[PDB]
Design a protein around this ligand. Structure first.
Ligand SMILES: CCCCCCCCCCCCCCCCCC(=O)OC[C@H](COP(=O)([O-])OCC(O)COP(=O)([O-])OC[C@@H](COC(=O)CCCCCCCCCCCCCCCCC)OC(=O)CCCCCCCCCCCCCCCCC)OC(=O)CCCCCCCCCCCCCCCCC
Ligand SMILES: CCCCCCCCCCCCCCCCCC(=O)OC[C@H](COP(=O)([O-])OCC(O)COP(=O)([O-])OC[C@@H](COC(=O)CCCCCCCCCCCCCCCCC)OC(=O)CCCCCCCCCCCCCCCCC)OC(=O)CCCCCCCCCCCCCCCCC
Ligand SMILES: CCCCCCCCCCCCCCCCCC(=O)OC[C@H](COP(=O)([O-])OCC(O)COP(=O)([O-])OC[C@@H](COC(=O)CCCCCCCCCCCCCCCCC)OC(=O)CCCCCCCCCCCCCCCCC)OC(=O)CCCCCCCCCCCCCCCCC
Ligand SMILES: CCCCCCCCCCCCCCCCC[C@@H](O)O[C@H](CO[C@H](O)CCCCCCCCCCCCCCC)COP(=O)(O)OCC[N+](C)(C)C
Ligand SMILES: CCCCCCCC/C=C\CCCCCCCC(=O)OC[C@H](COP(=O)(O)OCCN)OC(=O)CCCCCCC/C=C\CCCCCCCC
Ligand SMILES: CCCCCCCC/C=C\CCCCCCCC(=O)OC[C@H](COP(=O)(O)OCCN)OC(=O)CCCCCCC/C=C\CCCCCCCC
Ligand SMILES: CCCCCCCCCCCCCCCCCC(=O)OC[C@H](COP(=O)(O)OCCN)OC(=O)CCCCCCCCCCCCCCCCC
Ligand SMILES: CCCCCCCCCCCCCCCCCC(=O)OC[C@H](COP(=O)(O)OCCN)OC(=O)CCCCCCCCCCCCCCCCC
Ligand SMILES: Nc1ncnc2c1ncn2[C@@H]1O[C@H](COP(=O)(O)OP(=O)(O)O)[C@@H](O)[C@H]1O
Lengths: 121, 459, 321, 98, 56, 347, 49
């Protein structure tokens, strides 16, 4: 477990307060559109299994499918973005606080670097 | 690439929402329009690739393959509408959906800029093909053919997935541009040998290599006509494209690891041509000819010179077109007499003249007849192999002689002689079949007219 | 609630509460061309119970969609007239008819049990799945069907009828075979005029030797002759004064009734084992014919979708349903 | 560790080996299963009493409670098997195969 | 009538509008990669008096 | 069984699992295991027949032995540390005992035979609940105690589970035994990734649970418990067979379906830890699972088997009970590959 | 009338239809409000607007 037991972590909290400082996902997010597509597919499959007209029947039910998927997808995307931002924050903090473990290296040009040549023949 | 990708994902709902008798018309018209749109990818640069976005890019190697796929879809639609007359509307739409999904996956495969996305898409291409084969095949052996095809491909490709994730962990990226610019030599070690083996073996199984090719006759003979067309024209070119893409990071280990594969390719090219000489099934003959041509392509990619890559690209395009046309001709014959035996139907020149002309032109393109792009690619590969060594000319000459022998043997057996007396249901050739043959053959001649469009980035 | 289920059960709907001690299952039985149908009509109308005529072919057609019978090619694929004309067919018509009739009787018994458990009103059936086997034995002893067909019938009957409650009253009408043949000749229908005397005798032997001895142990059995069956007043009086507490119905409880009602209200679970993968040439249908006939059935007018979602039969508000 | 702990752990091991090696009767294996919990109870109370973990003295009683719950479950399954077959032999539990 | 023609031939706009939407999304993807616009050493130049960006 | 008693037994099973997953005390975790088993036995014996009774007996014996070993491990750990909190275990012997007990509870090889035996013995609803929930709990305990897991023992049992599941599923014709061997193989994959990334373990658990729920609910909808019984479903409701086919393709790990995501992520994570031989063997061995999934797909949807004559009456009648969340489980088990980076949210 | 028995879904369950539409509308308006508040809080915390 990498980020389990992280200091200051409140248990059973889907989205902490520190996540409010990150940019929320746009409503036209391609991931949100894909979640809505999944909801629409679920509605179509529901109509197919219940032997209703797949495309025409149950418009309210299909709309509820799409809406529920979009809602949960928006919150899931918020949590995913928060976790990735937290990972980057921790990585940068560790790199900064361990300079002897992460030292800068002198940059040499390819005019100085000697690379062996392997002819293709 | 979205201007081409989205119209396919719109072909899907159009197919599912069109009327029962209009599905073929709508699909054919809009597939032809999408092919015309995709013709704009041929305008490539001399320095680098066309980098549309972070996810998709096009090159002088990807563009002809994409154009070939987009052109191949409507021909498959024509053949499928030929052999699926009594099907239900839902199953017709499902077959069209499988073809559309396959085309979409192939487009995204050829334009994918990362190796892992390329792996995902080129493995996703298996599901529609397996469904098509094992569902709309005519004979019992379709199930075994599908099992062989699927398991050969997957047993080849899983070590490729492991190698790709390992390479990402080691180098930081699987992006093709980054791995090309940041490439480092591969030292002679067991670990590097097995990484090279994983990648090359995946794509060799896809090619297929000699000794790893039984699934090809199994699937090609037992698949429906559209499945046979897509399997030979495009799905065999994923291996060559992948090998021409991965070999950037496999040097200088390709100088020493290519010997067994080169020997297998050359000797199995000879052996599969000889097998073509003694085939009692027409589809099997076409499949083994495909095996020989792809073995020549493997030789080109393994010798890995700028003259070999151009020949490999030209031969891949030419073989795709020619093999698709041959499968279509054999399928028309099968739809006549309901049997794949070559010697069952004879005198087809005196019974169907214009189909005899189509057979003649297809056979002349199958063998390297100048100035066809088939001969252009084969001659470039032979010249590169000659620079590699001077007995490859002996092997290539033997292969060319046997190729001409079996091509003209097929032509003379099917078309010449006297007709079978008791076969009296050979109706005159349809306008649809004639148009299918014309659309197969004319672009090949136009490509012969303009050959720099299919010679790859090394041109 | 709004539909029977575990929620209704925990809410408090109880079959014992619903019953009124007049909720009885009465099955009238007899040989071919008896007065059993008229006797069942009279008993049902005098006792105020619901009458269920004999479940022949197209009973499921009568209970589903519109009540009109469907095509024989789509519902049953068997012919009683063809069985009479050529009993020893080479296409398995005899056993196809027998198995289809058993399935129809199973469906009718499930419907009757559902009606009794949901309304409390008794039901009078013109025949049951417990009396159906007599025609199977009559066919078998006459060489009309095969031992494999008999074994498949026995397997299906076991796994299906083992789950239901036997009738309260079994009323058998005994008529001699010469009288049966005289009535058949008087009726004048040619196909049943082709019935032989041995076939009629086998049915009576199966009734006398197996069905009646088997039903006697379970509950009361009433036997009447032609004259006795003609006077239904005495039959109803005899039924009304039957004392019996040895049947499984007194042993049934609310939970057992709940399980039985959940079973009988599900018509696909009733017919679950009527189609088991036993490949007899009589009853097995090939893939191509199965696909074609299924396509035709789906092309039937009110059969493409669920009952509430068929626009071509005048169903509206589909987009909000 | 003293030899008393060794003896209790050996008793648990013996009772475990007995359960894993059936002979004919399910009741005998149920008795072997009951003995394992007796050894667990003895070991736990010996450990707790020696370390003066005062609040842990209630754990062995809960152990006994769930022990006899398991014993009740085993007895119920045994009576169902015996009703089905006439004997509590484990050889009759062979309808299901791997 | 005219209604039936639209009722049946309305699927013929799906692929064209998909092509239009694909071109639009290609423009959207291109406009996110403008961090080296008029900054490459090869193609760097001074803007004309009546232009804001070198390309779009 | 009264519906109130059945729902209270389900509530008690869930209460035992939740007690295991919320407790910080080894005694309370053991109590949760005991409560789960006690309320789970009658669920297995709900539909009374000799097969159900035998399955319940075997399940009870296996789980009782595992609980005895688990409590012995707890006591041995307490002896050398005096600690009741569930953390890294302080004694290697106690850790080995706990690992073997939890592997036996899960069904990891060589403790697997009871899984096909019980799954065949019990009905479809019982098998669904068994597989899903009874894998849910011990995996939680293992994830909590992962940092003391012996990698050699865990990976050995995982690879054995993968191989044995593949071979058993190859041989079986019964759908419940096929599902049991599939469960064994998936548990092998999960426990193989466990000593490296509990997040990947949880991801594989979620995807496996979704696919298993979809498959079991499809089987309940079709009322088919054998291969030939499933071969008749194309003639009554062909949509269910197609959905089952795509679900089977997903469970085999074929891209671009949901079943490829756990295998892909696990292979990547194990490669990050310089493991190549194990990922390659695990990837190659799953082709057996794919083969018998494909064999099942041939019989049900890709080909048309012969049917019977009462199927016409079955046509005339309509399915009454509605499966809850079946379309959602079918969609989530096939079309969530583009949503892979949500495992960070799962973290 | 076509069916011999009144179908269970003969007429729309208006209670279920109204609840479905209301739930969809409520979820959409709640999502819009949540997104607006999230954008405002992000701007306020980062000192953008
Ligand atoms: C649309 C493209 C989708 C691509 C994939 C995307 C993901 C999946 C889609 C979601 C699920 C869709 C519904 C599934 C069930 C469909 C059932 C059916 O009959 O459907 C017919 C139905 C119309 O018929 P109907 O009158 O309602 O009822 C007739 C009966 O159903 C007649 O039924 P029947 O009784 O005749 O049933 C028999 C039939 C029953 O067969 C089926 O029901 C087939 C479909 C179900 C199988 C599984 C579907 C996929 C589920 C997810 C799995 C992964 C998918 C991706 C896989 C990739 C790799 C392969 O079985 C067979 O024929 C058996 C032989 C074949 C078996 C072997 C082949 C199996 C292939 C499995 C994979 C298929 C992938 C694509 C599926 C596309 C489905 C439309 O049409 C559709 O459902 C079309 C799709 C919805 C279109 C919406 C259009 C909206 C308006 C235009 C929008 C334009 C774009 C918007 C943007 C703005 C533009 C301006
Ligand atoms: C058995 C007789 C035998 O060894 O035949 C080799 C022979 C290869 O041709 P070659 O021209 O004799 O080999 C050139 C040098 O001798 C060997 O080449 P080199 O000395 O320049 O060093 C390169 C060598 C480096 O050597 C090593 O890496 C040796 C260490 C073991 C590598 C194992 C790799 C396995 C890869 C998957 C093979 C699946 C089959 O590369 C390989 O060993 C390549 C291994 C893959 C060969 C082709 C795989 C497809 C076979 C299709 C037919 C299957 C039936 O035939 C086969 O490998 C297939 C037929 C025999 C089985
Ligand atoms: C406490 C307050 C709430 C109480 C609610 C129940 C009481 C009121 C209704 C009532 O009387 O129900 C009686 C009714 C029993 O009546 P019955 O006539 O004996 O029916 C027998 C069969 O259920 C009849 O068979 P069936 O075909 O109706 O099967 C029903 C049931 C049979 O299956 C189950 O009961 C298994 C339930 C757990 C499934 C696995 C969940 C996995 C979650 C993984 C982690 C996700 C994060 O469910 C399924 O077959 C599909 C379950 C799908 C679950 C999907 C979960 C996604 C998350 O009780 C139930 O159906 C179970 C209620 C369980 C309540 C506890 C919470 C769950
Ligand atoms: C103050 C007043 C307002 C309070 C507001 C409420 C505060 C939050 C309340 C949360 C609900 C109450 C508790 C209910 C149970 C909590 C469940 C959840 O919230 O907890 C989080 C858990 O969240 C879930 O894990 C994320 C669900 C993600 C679902 C998708 C998984 C990703 C699948 C990848 C493919 C995606 C496909 C697309 C899916 C549709 C983190 O809890 P944590 O204590 O730390 O977990 C410990 C175990 N760990 C550490 C190993 C994780
Ligand atoms: C320690 C690592 C090794 C562990 C195992 C690694 C597995 C390696 C890859 C396995 C591939 C999976 C395919 C094999 C599945 C088992 C096949 C089998 O059981 O043989 C019998 C089977 C016949 O029986 P059934 O079809 O089941 O039905 C009989 C009806 N009466 O034989 C067959 O015809 C099936 C053949 C399947 C396709 C043939 C194999 C394809 C090629 C295999 C090698 C791949 C080449 C690599 C490139
Ligand atoms: C039975 C005999 C089977 C022989 C065929 C081999 C297939 C079995 C797979 C089992 C693995 C065997 C080879 C293992 C090679 C390996 O793991 O090392 C490769 C190297 C390890 O380096 P490090 O661990 O970091 O060492 C650091 C040094 N300081 O990692 C890599 O390069 C990734 C390579 C992926 C593993 C490739 C294994 C398969 C080899 C290619 C064969 C392709 C077969 C294709 C099948 C088609 C025809 C059947
Ligand atoms: C009716 C049948 C059921 C299917 C309903 C499909 C639509 C459901 C949503 C309705 C509209 C809700 C809404 O307000 O969406 C707006 C929101 C974006 O709004 P916002 O980003 O604030 O505005 C732009 C600012 N730059 O938009 C979003 O956030 C997008 C979320 C939805 C993604 C949908 C993906 C496709 C769903 C299936 C479409 C099917 C279309 C054809 C239906 C034919 C029916 C016969
Ligand atoms: C957090 C909630 C989880 C789900 C809880 C409820 C589960 C049981 C109920 C759903 C059963 C299957 C759906 C189809 C039902 C068909 C029968 C019918 O007519 O249903 C009508 C119903 C709308 O009824 P209504 O009461 O208005 O619903 C809103 C709440 N009052 O129509 C519907 O309900 C159809 C739309 C359902 C929504 C899709 C399913 C939930 C998806 C939530 C988003 C997350 C997706 C991933 C889920 C797993 C991970 C969390
Ligand atoms: N299981 C069966 N097998 C063959 N024929 C049957 C079966 N059950 C009923 N029949 C036929 O259906 C008809 C039932 O009517 P019947 O018993 O003569 O009473 P009624 O004279 O009142 O119509 C008979 O002609 C009988 O031959």
């Amino acid at each position: 477990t990498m980020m389990s037991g992280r200091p200051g972590r409140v248990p059973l909290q889907f989205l902490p307060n520190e996540a409010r400082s990150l940019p929320p996902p746009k409503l036209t997010d391609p991931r949100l559109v894909y979640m809505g597509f999944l909801g629409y597919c679920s509605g179509l499959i529901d109509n197919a299994i219940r032997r209703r007209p797949v495309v025409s029947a149950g418009l309210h039910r299909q709309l509820l499918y799409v809406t529920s998927f979009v809602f949960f997808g928006y919150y899931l995307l918020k949590r995913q973005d928060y976790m990735y931002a937290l990972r980057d924050h921790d990585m940068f903090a560790y790199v900064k606080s361990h300079p002897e473990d992460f030292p800068e290296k002198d940059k040499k040009t390819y005019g100085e670097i000697l690379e062996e040549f392997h002819p293709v023949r | 690439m979205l201007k081409i990708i989205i119209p396919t994902t719109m072909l899907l709902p159009m197919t599912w929402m069109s009327k029962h008798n209009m599905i073929w018309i709508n699909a054919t018209v809009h597939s032809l329009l999408i092919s015309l749109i995709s013709l704009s990818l041929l305008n490539q640069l001399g320095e680098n690739s066309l980098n549309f976005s972070l996810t998709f890019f096009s090159d002088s190697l990807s563009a002809p393959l994409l154009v070939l796929t987009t052109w191949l879809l409507p021909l498959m639609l024509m053949a499928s509408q030929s052999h699926l007359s009594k099907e239900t509307t839902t199953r017709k739409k499902l077959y069209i959906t499988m073809l559309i999904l396959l085309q979409l996956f192939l487009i995204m495969t050829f334009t994918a800029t990362e190796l892992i996305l390329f792996y995902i898409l080129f493995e996703a291409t298996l599901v529609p093909t397996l469904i098509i084969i094992t569902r709309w095949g005519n004979q019992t052996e379709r199930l075994n053919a599908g099992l062989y095809f699927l398991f050969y491909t997957l047993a080849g490709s899983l070590p490729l997935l492991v190698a790709l994730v390992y390479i990402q962990n080691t180098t930081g990226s699987l992006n093709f541009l980054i791995i090309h610019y940041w490439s480092h030599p591969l030292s002679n070690s067991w670990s590097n040998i097995f990484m090279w083996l994983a990648c090359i073996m995946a794509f060799m199984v896809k090619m297929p290599l000699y000794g790893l090719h039984l699934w090809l006759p199994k699937a090609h003979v037992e698949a429906p006509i559209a499945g046979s067309m897509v399997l030979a024209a495009v799905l065999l070119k994923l291996g060559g494209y992948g090998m021409m893409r991965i070999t950037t990071i496999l040097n200088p280990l390709t100088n020493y690891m290519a010997y067994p594969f080169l020997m297998l390719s050359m000797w199995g090219m000879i052996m599969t041509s000889s097998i073509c000489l003694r085939q009692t099934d027409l589809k099997s003959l076409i499949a083994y000819s495909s095996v020989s041509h792809m073995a020549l392509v493997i030789v080109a990619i393994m010798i890995q010179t700028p003259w070999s890559f151009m020949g490999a690209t030209a031969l891949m395009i030419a073989h795709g077109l020619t093999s698709s046309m041959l499968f279509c001709l054999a399928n028309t014959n099968y739809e006549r007499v309901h049997s794949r035996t070559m010697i069952l139907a004879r005198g087809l020149q005196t019974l169907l003249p214009l189909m005899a002309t189509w057979w003649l032109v297809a056979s002349l393109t199958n063998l390297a007849l100048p100035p066809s792009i088939n001969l252009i690619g084969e001659l470039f590969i032979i010249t590169a192999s000659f620079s590699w060594s001077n007995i490859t000319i002996i092997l290539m000459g033997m292969n060319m002689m046997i190729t001409a022998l079996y091509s003209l043997y097929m032509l003379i057996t099917t078309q010449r002689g006297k007709y079978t007396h008791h076969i009296n249901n050979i109706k005159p050739s349809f306008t649809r079949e004639n148009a299918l043959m014309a659309l197969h053959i004319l672009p090949l001649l136009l490509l012969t007219l303009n050959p720099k469009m299919i010679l790859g980035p090394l041109y | 609630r709004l539909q029977y289920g575990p929620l209704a059960f925990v809410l408090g709907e109880r079959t014992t509460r619903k019953l009124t001690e007049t909720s009885k299952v009465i099955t009238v039985d007899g040989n071919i061309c008896s007065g059993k149908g008229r006797l069942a009509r009279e008993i049902a109308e005098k006792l105020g119970l619901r009458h269920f005529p004999e479940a022949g072919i197209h009973y499921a057609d009568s209970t589903t969609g519109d009540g009109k019978p469907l095509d024989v090619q789509l519902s049953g694929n068997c012919s009683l007239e063809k069985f009479y004309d050529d009993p020893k067919s080479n296409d398995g018509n005899s056993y196809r008819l027998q198995s289809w009739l058993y399935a129809s009787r199973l469906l009718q018994y499930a419907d009757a049990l559902e009606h009794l458990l949901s309304t409390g009103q008794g039901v009078v059936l013109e025949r049951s799945i417990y009396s159906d086997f007599v025609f199977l034995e009559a066919m078998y002893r006459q060489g009309f069907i095969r031992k494999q067909c008999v074994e498949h019938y026995n397997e299906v009957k076991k796994v299906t009828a083992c789950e239901y409650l036997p009738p309260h009253v079994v009323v058998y009408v005994d008529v001699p075979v010469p009288e049966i043949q005289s009535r058949i000749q008087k009726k004048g229908n040619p196909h049943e005029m082709k019935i032989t005397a041995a076939y009629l005798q086998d049915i009576e032997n199966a009734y006398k030797k197996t069905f009646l001895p088997e039903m006697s142990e379970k509950c009361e059995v009433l036997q009447y002759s032609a004259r006795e069956a003609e006077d239904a007043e005495k039959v109803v009086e005899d039924i009304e004064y039957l004392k019996c507490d040895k049947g499984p119905w007194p042993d049934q409880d609310d939970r057992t009734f709940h399980r039985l009602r959940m079973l009988v209200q599900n018509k696909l679970e009733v017919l679950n084992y009527t189609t088991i993968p036993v490949y007899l040439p009589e009853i097995t249908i090939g893939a191509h014919q199965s696909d074609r006939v299924f396509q035709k059935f789906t092309e039937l007018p009110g059969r493409k979708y669920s009952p509430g979602y068929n626009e071509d039969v005048g169903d509206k508000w589909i987009w909000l349903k | 560790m003293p030899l008393v702990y060794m003896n209790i752990i050996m008793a648990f091991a013996i009772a475990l080996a007995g359960l894993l090696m059936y002979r004919s009767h399910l009741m005998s294996s149920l008795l072997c299963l009951e003995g394992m919990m007796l050894s667990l109870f003895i070991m736990s109370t010996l450990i707790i009493l020696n370390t003066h973990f005062t609040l842990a003295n209630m754990m062995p009683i809960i152990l006994l409670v769930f022990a006899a719950c398991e014993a009740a479950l085993g007895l119920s399954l045994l009576v169902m098997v015996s009703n089905t077959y006439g004997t509590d032999y484990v050889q009759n539990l062979n309808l299901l195969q791997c | 009538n005219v209604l039936q023609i639209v009722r049946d031939h309305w699927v013929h706009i799906l692929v064209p509008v998909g092509f239009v939407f694909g071109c639009y999304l290609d423009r959207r993807s291109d406009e996110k990669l403008t961090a080296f616009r008029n900054k490459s050493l090869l193609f760097k130049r001074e803007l004309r008096p009546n232009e804001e960006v070198t390309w779009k | 069984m009264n519906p109130i008693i059945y729902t209270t037994l389900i509530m008690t099973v869930m209460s035992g699992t939740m007690l295991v997953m919320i407790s910080s005390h080894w005694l309370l975790i053991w109590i949760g295991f005991e409560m789960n088993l006690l309320a789970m036995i009658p669920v297995l014996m709900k539909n009374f027949n000799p097969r159900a009774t035998e399955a319940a007996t075997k399940y009870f014996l296996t789980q009782a032995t595992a609980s005895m070993m688990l409590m012995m491990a707890i006591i041995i750990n307490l002896l050398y540390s005096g600690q009741w909190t569930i953390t890294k275990m302080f004694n290697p012997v106690a850790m080995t005992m706990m690992t073997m007990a939890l592997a036996m509870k899960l069904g990891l090889s060589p403790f697997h035979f009871w899984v096909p035996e019980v799954t065949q013995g019990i009905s479809l609803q019982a098998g669904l609940l068994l597989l899903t929930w009874q894998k849910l709990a011990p995996l939680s305990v293992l994830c909590q105690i992962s940092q003391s897991i012996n990698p050699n023992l865990m990976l050995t049992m995982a690879m054995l589970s993968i191989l044995i599941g593949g071979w058993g599923g190859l041989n079986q014709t019964q759908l419940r035994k096929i599902m049991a061997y599939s469960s064994i193989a998936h548990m092998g994959w999960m426990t193989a990734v466990l000593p490296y990334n509990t997040t990947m373990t949880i991801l594989n658990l979620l995807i496996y649970i979704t696919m298993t729920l979809a498959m079991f609910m499809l089987l309940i909808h079709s009322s088919a418990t054998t291969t030939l019984s499933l071969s008749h479903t194309w003639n009554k409701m062909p949509v269910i067979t197609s959905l089952m086919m795509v679900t089977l393709l997903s469970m085999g790990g074929l891209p671009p379906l949901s079943g490829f995501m756990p295998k892909w992520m696990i292979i990547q994570e194990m490669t990050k830890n310089e493991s190549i031989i194990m990922p390659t063997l695990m990837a190659m061995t799953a082709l057996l699972n794919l083969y018998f999934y494909m064999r099942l797909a041939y019989s049900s949807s890709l080909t048309m088997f012969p049917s019977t004559n009462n199927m016409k009456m079955k046509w005339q009648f309509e399915h009454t009970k509605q499966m809850k969340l079946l379309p959602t489980m079918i969609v989530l088990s096939t079309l969530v590959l583009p949503m892979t980076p949500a495992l960070s949210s799962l973290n | 009338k076509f069916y011999i028995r009144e179908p269970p879904h003969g007429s729309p369950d208006w209670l279920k239809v109204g609840l479905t539409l209301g739930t969809s509308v409520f979820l959409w308006i709640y999502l819009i409000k949540q997104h607006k508040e999230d954008v405002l809080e992000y701007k306020r915390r980062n000192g953008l607007e």
